[PDB]
Design a protein around this ligand. Structure first.
Ligand SMILES: COc1ccc(Br)cc1-c1nc(N)nc2[nH]cnc12
Length: 127
């Protein structure tokens, strides 16, 4: 054991708002990545116990996953698009930090990240 508590997805102390960019992040970016054949290892927090990765949370100190992101978006947790984009970037970076180039999980992260970059390139101007 043990896993840390997951990242928070609600906090009434955190300022938040809905923006057209955050709506795009949910409706376009997250939906595209979520349906990909390679999304599955990124859809929930790493369970280091079940996966027998005892070093995971010694190495990765700012964990993030698309389950968390989806709930943050659905819960209007974010103040702006940059906060959400930073969560996706943390998710990808963590995978590259923990694993090694050529590992299947890294190939999968790379395929998701490429789609992410393609979709974030068309992030709308703030309304
Ligand atoms: C939720 O994570 C997984 C679920 C099932 C399985 Br099999 C592997 C992972 C996983 N494993 C590793 N080594 N690094 C990761 N980075 C993001 N996912 C992972």
């Amino acid at each position: 054991s043990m896993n840390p508590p997951p990242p928070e997805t609600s906090n009434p102390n955190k300022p938040k708002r809905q923006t057209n960019q955050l709506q795009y992040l949910l409706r376009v970016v997250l939906k595209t990545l979520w349906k990909h054949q390679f999304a599955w290892p990124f859809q929930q927090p790493v369970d280091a116990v079940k996966l027998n990765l005892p070093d995971y949370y010694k190495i990765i100190k700012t964990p993030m996953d698309m389950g968390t992101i989806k709930k943050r978006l659905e819960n209007n947790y974010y103040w702006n698009a940059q906060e959400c984009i930073q969560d996706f970037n943390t998710m990808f970076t963590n995978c590259y930090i923990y694993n090694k180039p050529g590992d299947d999980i890294v190939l999968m992260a790379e395929a998701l990240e490429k789609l992410f970059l393609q979709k974030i390139n068309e992030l709308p101007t703030e309304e």
